[PDB]
Symmetry: C5
Subunit: 99 residues, 5 copies
């Protein structure tokens, strides 16, 4: 809420808050990352896909899985696994059971 | 007349204060003209939301109409509409999702 | 003569000639005959996503868009900026979609 | 020749080589442009659409027409005519004959 | 893991690690970053004259060894880049992917 952070994911810059990253849930890699490496703009470097990082950060923001038509849910699942957000993994699995 | 830049999720939007304050003024968005969110390096006011689902919001602020392209999940628009507190667009969106 | 436009946050670049020749009767051409930001770009409080087909139509006089984009979005910028011919093209385009 | 060139197309920056812009289309406007109008970043200014310019540049790169679903081929055809690359014009016309 | 690199592909900047570029395909031309590539822009990114739009799935496959793209994406554009950079496994994967839509 008060502490602003910038994340360099794969070359794309996201801006968020520490509170968003460490809360809901605190038991993910992401949360333990921000409590390393610095790029040329101060942002913290992450070697993943930013295209499939959007729904991850959004789910961190409001706890809901929202995505546009045609977007492969497998990538989102992969990134969710990497960062270790369990709830989103479950939601994604019950989402891929019936597509 | 008075131009503002917003940093939403890492994406920069340029508009005017008039667009944000007017139509409608009983949202937190309009209330953000009085808040310690101003400082990034380009002077843009920081907002921790999805920029992808923010463009229809700003456009609705610009011309009072809901326009999005095919395949766009307007649930994500509804969530932003709730967060920023634009009630008219919330209604618009609900009657929009009633039959899709 | 080169100009840069800041539309809704997105920077487009085009000659003044394209903005003024064809569509000499509405606000776009009338703006550029002679308010700016740091990069010297002319500020426009509209949607850039629906602004690209407008500028394309200014460039070669044709309405070309990919599958899925809402023609209403293009029509709203077309009304705002005031390109009559493109408004006609768009209306006859929405007649049968 | 074989210098790294930057093109400012419609406000979007593309990076390539002179070789790519000259060879496999020596009889086009593009090739005729780069043998010897710059913005501040030194990029050469082109007043066209970048969204329909990427497939053009790609065709320059590997001589093939590749485009995602839903992309209007007409927009590519117009740029194809403007830059005067006849082979790609032919490809495009036989591509629009059956869509 | 520790060594960060920026690639300028066709004008678009990707950021990754040398580890990702040289492991899980050390015999592809990309592994020419197994040494340090003496062509750099002003920012310092290594220049590559290809399409960035079809470079995303390549780099992602380098990252987690899986072919993941959204609906409507022309797989041919990915195949061309895979051929250029010389990732054979991805070429096989793509070939068995295209012969049945």
């Amino acid at each position: 809420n008060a502490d602003w952070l910038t994340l360099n994911v794969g070359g794309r810059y996201f801006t968020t808050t520490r509170s968003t990253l460490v809360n809901k849930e605190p038991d993910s890699m992401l949360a333990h990352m921000f409590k390393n490496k610095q790029d040329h703009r101060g942002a913290f470097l992450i070697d993943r896909s930013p295209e499939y990082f959007e729904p991850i950060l959004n789910y961190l923001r409001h706890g809901q899985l929202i995505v546009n038509d045609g977007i492969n849910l497998l990538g989102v699942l992969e990134e969710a696994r990497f960062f270790g957000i369990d709830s989103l993994i479950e939601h994604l699995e019950v989402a891929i059971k019936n597509s």
